């Protein structure tokens, strides 16, 4: 229905705002663009599902997210990809892991404070009805 389309449009507006807030934070600059195969030629071989905030904006605009749970699965991938690719005790890897965990925790904290649970439940029920 047009009412269900309005629901998904509100979801996209909400997810674009959350993603913009993460992308303008200087801590998360490394997560704003895909990894350059020049700097890192082994990345695309180790990480099977690369994800970054530019890709997340593209997915929002392609109507790939019908629930906040589907969005958070891609935020979780940004975090888990960084924990897997950068697992060493050296400060460079520790700094990327801390920044990836902070991204993920920030996204969840914004959603906990600003997403109505009844709005999420409505999205989940339209998605399940298709
Ligand atoms: Cl830095």
From Swiss-Prot:
Highly expressed in estrogen receptor positive breast tumors and in osteosarcoma tumors. It is found in: Nucleus. Residues 3-114 form the Bromo domain. Transmembrane segments: none annotated. Induction: Up-regulated in breast, uterus, colon, ovary, and stomach tumors. Induced in breast cancer cells overexpressing NCOA3 or treated with estrogen. Down-regulated in 5-fluorouracil-resistant derivatives of the colon cancer cell line HCT 116. Residues 108-130 form a coiled coil. Interacts with ESR1 and NCOA3 and these interactions are enhanced by estradiol. Interacts with acetylated lysine residues on histone H1.4, H2A, H2B and H3 (in vitro). May be a transcriptional coactivator of the nuclear receptor ESR1 required to induce the expression of a subset of estradiol target genes, such as CCND1, MYC and E2F1. May play a role in the recruitment or occupancy of CREBBP at some ESR1 target gene promoters. May be required for histone hyperacetylation. Involved in the estrogen-induced cell proliferation and cell cycle progression of breast cancer cells. Belongs to the AAA ATPase family. This is ATPase family AAA domain-containing protein 2. The gene is ATAD2. The chain holds residues 981 to 1108 of 1390 of the full protein.
